[PDB]
Scaffold this active site. Sequence first.
Site, PDB file in Angstrom:
ATOM      1  CG  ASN A   1     -11.984  31.116  17.879  1.00  0.00           C
ATOM      2  OD1 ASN A   1     -11.602  30.716  18.927  1.00  0.00           O
ATOM      3  ND2 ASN A   1     -11.118  30.511  16.419  1.00  0.00           N
ATOM      4  CG  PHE A   2      -7.785  33.565  19.304  1.00  0.00           C
ATOM      5  CD1 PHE A   2      -7.193  32.762  20.133  1.00  0.00           C
ATOM      6  CD2 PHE A   2      -7.911  33.378  17.644  1.00  0.00           C
ATOM      7  CE1 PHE A   2      -6.682  32.280  19.542  1.00  0.00           C
ATOM      8  CE2 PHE A   2      -7.062  32.732  17.094  1.00  0.00           C
ATOM      9  CZ  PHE A   2      -6.463  32.054  17.794  1.00  0.00           C
ATOM     10  CG  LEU A   3     -14.115  36.534  24.518  1.00  0.00           C
ATOM     11  CD1 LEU A   3     -13.965  37.964  24.774  1.00  0.00           C
ATOM     12  CD2 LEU A   3     -16.382  35.567  24.085  1.00  0.00           C
ATOM     13  CB  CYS A   4      -8.626  36.595  25.566  1.00  0.00           C
ATOM     14  SG  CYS A   4      -7.402  35.862  27.116  1.00  0.00           S
ATOM     15  CB  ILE A   5     -11.447  38.906  29.650  1.00  0.00           C
ATOM     16  CG1 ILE A   5     -12.155  39.781  28.770  1.00  0.00           C
ATOM     17  CG2 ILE A   5     -11.009  40.203  30.964  1.00  0.00           C
ATOM     18  CD1 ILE A   5     -13.510  39.842  28.531  1.00  0.00           C
TER      19      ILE A   5
ATOM     20  CG  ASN B   1     -16.252  37.664  38.294  1.00  0.00           C
ATOM     21  OD1 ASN B   1     -16.345  37.067  39.171  1.00  0.00           O
ATOM     22  ND2 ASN B   1     -16.550  37.063  36.603  1.00  0.00           N
ATOM     23  CE  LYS B   2     -13.444  45.934  37.095  1.00  0.00           C
ATOM     24  NZ  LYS B   2     -14.380  46.158  38.109  1.00  0.00           N
ATOM     25  NE  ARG B   3     -22.777  42.151  32.237  1.00  0.00           N
ATOM     26  CZ  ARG B   3     -23.812  40.445  31.926  1.00  0.00           C
ATOM     27  NH1 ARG B   3     -23.070  39.581  32.454  1.00  0.00           N
ATOM     28  NH2 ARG B   3     -24.383  41.332  31.358  1.00  0.00           N
TER      29      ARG B   3
ATOM     30  CB  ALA C   1     -16.919  38.770  28.671  1.00  0.00           C
TER      31      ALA C   1
ATOM     32  CB  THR D   1     -17.902  27.359  19.687  1.00  0.00           C
ATOM     33  OG1 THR D   1     -16.095  27.002  20.592  1.00  0.00           O
ATOM     34  CG2 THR D   1     -16.726  27.552  18.869  1.00  0.00           C
TER      35      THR D   1
ATOM     36  CG  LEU E   1      -9.252  27.470  14.424  1.00  0.00           C
ATOM     37  CD1 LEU E   1      -8.018  28.369  14.723  1.00  0.00           C
ATOM     38  CD2 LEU E   1      -9.436  26.252  13.678  1.00  0.00           C
TER      39      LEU E   1
HETATM   40  C1  LIG Z   1      -9.536  22.672  24.698  1.00  0.00           C
HETATM   41  C2  LIG Z   1     -10.334  20.358  24.831  1.00  0.00           C
HETATM   42  C3  LIG Z   1      -9.165  20.117  25.411  1.00  0.00           C
HETATM   43  C4  LIG Z   1      -8.321  19.701  26.294  1.00  0.00           C
HETATM   44  O1  LIG Z   1      -8.494  20.652  26.985  1.00  0.00           O
HETATM   45  C5  LIG Z   1      -7.928  18.814  27.059  1.00  0.00           C
HETATM   46  N1  LIG Z   1      -7.211  17.376  25.702  1.00  0.00           N
HETATM   47  C6  LIG Z   1      -6.911  16.541  26.767  1.00  0.00           C
HETATM   48  C7  LIG Z   1      -6.921  17.271  27.796  1.00  0.00           C
HETATM   49  N2  LIG Z   1      -7.090  18.604  27.693  1.00  0.00           N
HETATM   50  C8  LIG Z   1      -6.431  19.937  29.197  1.00  0.00           C
HETATM   51  O2  LIG Z   1      -9.999  18.459  25.093  1.00  0.00           O
HETATM   52  C9  LIG Z   1     -10.862  18.772  24.114  1.00  0.00           C
HETATM   53  C10 LIG Z   1     -11.077  17.881  22.748  1.00  0.00           C
HETATM   54  C11 LIG Z   1     -12.378  18.359  22.146  1.00  0.00           C
HETATM   55  C12 LIG Z   1     -12.113  19.499  22.294  1.00  0.00           C
HETATM   56  C13 LIG Z   1     -11.648  20.542  22.331  1.00  0.00           C
HETATM   57  O3  LIG Z   1     -11.217  21.717  21.644  1.00  0.00           O
HETATM   58  C14 LIG Z   1     -12.018  22.224  21.247  1.00  0.00           C
HETATM   59  C15 LIG Z   1     -11.564  23.597  20.236  1.00  0.00           C
HETATM   60  C16 LIG Z   1      -9.854  23.908  20.234  1.00  0.00           C
HETATM   61  N3  LIG Z   1      -9.645  25.702  20.811  1.00  0.00           N
HETATM   62  C17 LIG Z   1      -8.123  25.408  20.981  1.00  0.00           C
HETATM   63  C18 LIG Z   1      -7.907  26.917  20.443  1.00  0.00           C
HETATM   64  C19 LIG Z   1      -7.319  27.347  20.097  1.00  0.00           C
HETATM   65  C20 LIG Z   1      -7.014  28.879  19.956  1.00  0.00           C
HETATM   66  C21 LIG Z   1      -7.349  29.847  21.039  1.00  0.00           C
HETATM   67  N4  LIG Z   1      -7.286  29.076  22.084  1.00  0.00           N
HETATM   68  C22 LIG Z   1      -7.918  27.412  21.987  1.00  0.00           C
HETATM   69  C23 LIG Z   1     -10.885  20.170  23.764  1.00  0.00           C
END
Ligand SMILES: Cc1c(C(=O)c2nccn2C)oc2cccc(OCCCNCc3cccnc3)c12
Length: 384
Positions: free
Chosen positions: A108-112, A118-120, A122, A144, A384
Site C-alpha cells: 500500500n501507499f505506493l507514491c512517487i 514516467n521514469k519507470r 514505480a 489495488t 485501505l
Molecule cells: C478514493 C475514493 C473516492 C473519492 O476520491 C471521492 N469520494 C468522494 C469524492 N471523491 C473524489 O470515492 C471512493 C468510493 C469508494 C472507494 C474509494 O476508495 C477506496 C480506497 C481508498 N484508499 C484511501 C487511501 C488510504 C490510504 C492512502 N491512500 C488512500 C473512493
Amino acid sequence: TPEDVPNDPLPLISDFEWSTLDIDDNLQLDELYKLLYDNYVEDIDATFRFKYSHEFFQWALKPPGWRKDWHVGVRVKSTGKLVAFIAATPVTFKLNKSNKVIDSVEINFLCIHKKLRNKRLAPVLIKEITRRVNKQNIWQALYTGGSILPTPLTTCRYQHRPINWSKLHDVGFSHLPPNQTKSSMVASYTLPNNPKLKGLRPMTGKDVSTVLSLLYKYQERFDIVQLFTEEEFKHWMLGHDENSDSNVVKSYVVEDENGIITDYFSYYLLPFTVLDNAQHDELGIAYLFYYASDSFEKPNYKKRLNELITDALITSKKFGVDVFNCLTCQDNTYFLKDCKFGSGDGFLNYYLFNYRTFPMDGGIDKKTKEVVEDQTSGIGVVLL
Ligand SMILES: Cc1c(C(=O)c2nccn2C)oc2cccc(OCCCNCc3cccnc3)c12
C-alpha cells in the site's frame, strides 16, 4: 545463471538512494505526510487532497506484526528530500474454495513525486518491497490500483452515499440531475438522527472474541477473505488501543433481547481538503470496512442488511461525514440501490502477486461495468 560472468550490463550511478522510513521518529512521519499530501492521487478533476493524520498512520501502518524494513522510501542524495514511498503490511488471507491460508502482505501507499513520473520508478519500487518481503518467506501479495499490471482478480466500482448533499454540491462534486432542485435533493438524501436498530452500540474489546466468530461464519460466502488473530482484529476495529477511543475507525455491534450479537459493521474516516473554496476546506468521508450479520441464512437477510447499513450512516453524521463511500465488493450490491448509494466514476483493480486463481466477481456487470443488484461478490477483503 548461475554464471561465471553476468550476461547483462551492470547499473549506472543514480541521483537517488534507498531510505527505510521510521514512522516512530515524528520528524520522518512528517515527511511522509508532506510527500503524500503533495503527490498522491485524489479526484481526477484535481481539487481534493487526502487529509492524513498522525493518528491515521499509526493505525494503518502499525498493525500487530508490522516491520520497519517494509516501509521503503527513496530520497535524493543531494538534498535528502523524500520523493517516493511504498509500504507493506502483514496480512493473512484465505481462499474459501480451495481451502488455503496464505500468510502474505498488503502493498500500500505506493507514491512517487508529482515531478518524477514516467521514469519507470514505480516498477523499481515494487520489485524492491517484494525483495524485502520474499526475505521473510512470504511470496504472495495484495494490491489495488490502475489496470496496469495484467491478470487482476476482479474489478470493483465506487459508490457514494451523500449524507450532506448541499455542501457536496457547493464543492462541485455531486451534480444536480436534469430539472430538480437543490432544496429537494437535500430531502431525497435526508436521514434520521438516530439509529433505528435497537440493541445497537459501539463495540468494545470485550466483543472481539464473539464478533470475530460471527464474521468468520459470514465471509464463508466469498472466495477470498481475511483471517485475523485476536490481537489483530482488535487493532483494525478498535484502534491503537481500546482504553483510548480511535478517531479513525468506528465499529458497532447490535445485540438482541438475550444479549447476543447478531450484526455488526465498521468503517473508517479519512477526510478530504477542499482547496479553492471560500466556504469550507474539509470534506468528511467514511469508507465501509468490514461487517456481518447472522441473518444471511434467514430470508430477511437483505431487509436486515439494508437497515444495518442505514444505521451505520445515521452514525456517520456524529463525526462530520458528508459522503459515505464503499466499493462493490462483498455483499454490498444488496444494500446499494435502496440505500440511495450513488454509482461512482472510479474503478479499482485487485491483484494477487505470484499466485494463480480463478477470476472472481467484482460486483459490476463486466460489460457495462455498471452495478448489478443482489450479487454476492468474490471479494471479501477491504484494503485501505
Ligand atoms: C478514493 C475514493 C473516492 C473519492 O476520491 C471521492 N469520494 C468522494 C469524492 N471523491 C473524489 O470515492 C471512493 C468510493 C469508494 C472507494 C474509494 O476508495 C477506496 C480506497 C481508498 N484508499 C484511501 C487511501 C488510504 C490510504 C492512502 N491512500 C488512500 C473512493
